[PDB]
């Protein structure tokens, strides 16, 4: 069934599962043509496939060449997402294949269900949670590798860096979603918070700065405060 606040801890049990977010698969800029009409130009995108227990991220880069000569691209993007997710599962050894795939947008259920017909025991689930994974391109190293790609490419990361050496998956996922919620609501401020102190660096093999435990508490407070502010601004409350 659908994933929601009630069954939220299921994400951190030992059944392998993956979130699939397709929001950044088909990305355009909108511009005016010489004659004054509107046209789009595609830029590179990505499927965001994440195991919330381990942090393993399967970033499948979607090169603009995929769209060439295709119609109804927003629809096609859903099927290409499902195609690539299905290929990823096929590429994993059996013991690593997920037992569930949770799609962040309901429009993905039928495309993935159809592409996964060979895996009847992998359950495809929607979610009622409003997850912030669209802000994934606000993480500088992800945006960089997507925009530079010259061909289809799978790049692997751990989205938790080394946090699991010191915290649980539940706390790690809460930290990640908080960081991304912030980046989504006000990227400029969120990013200012993360880098204000030049003495805290990002390891070459990490995505986020190497905050000490105490500094993560201050960070997370600063991200909470950001998110509350923006809300009063949005709704005048």
């Amino acid at each position: 069934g659908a994933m929601n606040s009630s069954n939220y801890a299921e994400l951190f049990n030992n059944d392998i599962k993956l979130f699939v977010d397709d929001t950044n698969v088909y990305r355009v800029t909108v511009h005016k043509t010489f004659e004054g009409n509107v046209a789009t130009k595609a830029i590179n995108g990505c499927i965001f496939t994440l195991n919330p227990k381990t942090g393993h991220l399967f970033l499948k880069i979607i090169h603009t060449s995929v769209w060439a000569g295709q119609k109804r691209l927003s629809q096609l993007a859903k099927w290409k997402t499902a195609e690539e997710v299905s290929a990823l599962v096929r590429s994993l050894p059996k013991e690593e294949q997920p037992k569930q795939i949770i799609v962040t947008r309901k429009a993905m259920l039928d495309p993935l269900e159809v592409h996964m017909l060979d895996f009847p025991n992998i359950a495809i689930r929607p979610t009622e949670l409003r997850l912030p994974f669209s802000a994934a391109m606000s993480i500088d190293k992800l945006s960089d590798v997507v925009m530079k790609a010259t061909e289809p490419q799978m790049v692997l990361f751990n989205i938790y860096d080394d946090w699991l050496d010191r915290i649980s998956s539940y706390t790690a996922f809460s930290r990640l979603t908080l960081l991304l919620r912030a980046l989504k609501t006000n990227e400029e401020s969120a990013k200012m918070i993360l880098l204000s102190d030049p003495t805290i660096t990002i390891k070459s093999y990490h995505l986020w700065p190497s905050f000490t435990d105490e500094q993560w508490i201050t960070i997370e407070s600063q991200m909470r405060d950001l998110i509350l502010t923006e809300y009063g601004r949005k709704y005048n409350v």
Binding site: L76, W79, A82, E83, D110, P111, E113, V114, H115, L117, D118
Partner: peptide, 16 residues
């Protein structure tokens, strides 16, 4: 409509 019988492998989207 969501069965192997209904959907040729490789024509997933087209056949659906």
């Amino acid at each position: 409509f969501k069965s192997r019988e209904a959907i040729r492998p490789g024509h997933e989207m087209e056949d659906f």
